């Protein structure tokens, strides 16, 4: 071997020290990417007159019945992917000391 197997381990340990960090930050660009998609898709509310205040709540009420339809049809695509993964994963799967020292010395 061209290098000490104790340095080979030093490098290996140092690689997974940043892939975790580049994942605690990937999952951080995604925390923000959420709130930026929830001020565009969920433009917060601010107030009206006892008339055309009403034709707002009848539009939100018509939005929820659609939003949850948008959420359902993507769920059943995630739900189906979970099924195929454990179906793919099934195909591929088929293919002491300190008590001895104390009792000697």
């Amino acid at each position: 071997s061209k290098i000490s197997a104790s340095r080979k381990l030093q490098l290996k340990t140092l690689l997974l020290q940043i892939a975790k960090q580049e994942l605690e930050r990937e999952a951080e660009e995604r925390r923000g990417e959420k709130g930026r998609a929830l001020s565009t898709r969920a433009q917060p509310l601010e107030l009206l007159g006892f008339a055309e205040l009403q034709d707002l709540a009848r539009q939100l009420h018509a939005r929820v019945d659609k939003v949850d339809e948008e959420r359902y049809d993507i769920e059943a695509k995630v739900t189906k992917n979970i099924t195929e993964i454990a179906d793919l994963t099934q195909k591929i799967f088929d293919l002491s000391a300190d008590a001895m020292m104390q009792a000697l010395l």
Partner: protein
């Protein structure tokens, strides 16, 4: 999981290679070839709360008999004493994507080499060479997901 035992054998303090060396001369107080066999390993096992069978005794030796003699000598003893002194598969997959930047399902030499540079430490030319062929157990140029596990066993 082999070249990680030598890592904790090289890093053994000489104040620890003295106890082990002492406790190894007591181990073999009665063996011709001066080395641990099944007679001696029989003693400090059943005289230590077991009664392992003579074949079950010889398989605690074949795991560290890199000499084929069935006689665990000293250098084979430190390997044994560090096999008794990690990281999960469910976790080594969310790390396997931070290597695969082009998202192809493999890790080619230019994907590992950019990961080596971000370590703050100093990479040579030979560091990258021995690492890729430590992982690429078939020399196909990439470390697939099945090898990235046999690669990163026991890495803290």
């Amino acid at each position: 999981m082999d070249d990680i035992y030598k890592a904790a054998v090289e890093q053994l303090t000489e104040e620890q290679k003295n106890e082990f060396k002492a406790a190894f001369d007591i181990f073999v107080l009665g063996a011709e070839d001066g080395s641990i066999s099944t007679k001696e390993l029989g003693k400090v096992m059943r005289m230590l709360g077991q009664n392992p069978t003579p074949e079950e005794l010889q398989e605690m030796i074949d795991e560290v008999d890199e000499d084929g003699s069935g006689t665990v000598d000293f250098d084979e003893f430190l390997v044994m004493m560090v096999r008794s002194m990690g990281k999960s598969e469910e976790e080594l997959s969310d790390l396997f994507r931070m290597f695969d930047k082009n998202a192809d399902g493999y890790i080619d030499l230019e994907e590992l080499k950019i990961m080596l540079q971000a370590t703050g430490e100093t990479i040579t030319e030979d560091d990258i060479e021995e690492l890729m062929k430590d992982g690429d157990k078939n020399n196909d140029g990439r470390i697939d997901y099945d090898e990235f596990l046999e690669f990163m066993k026991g890495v803290e």
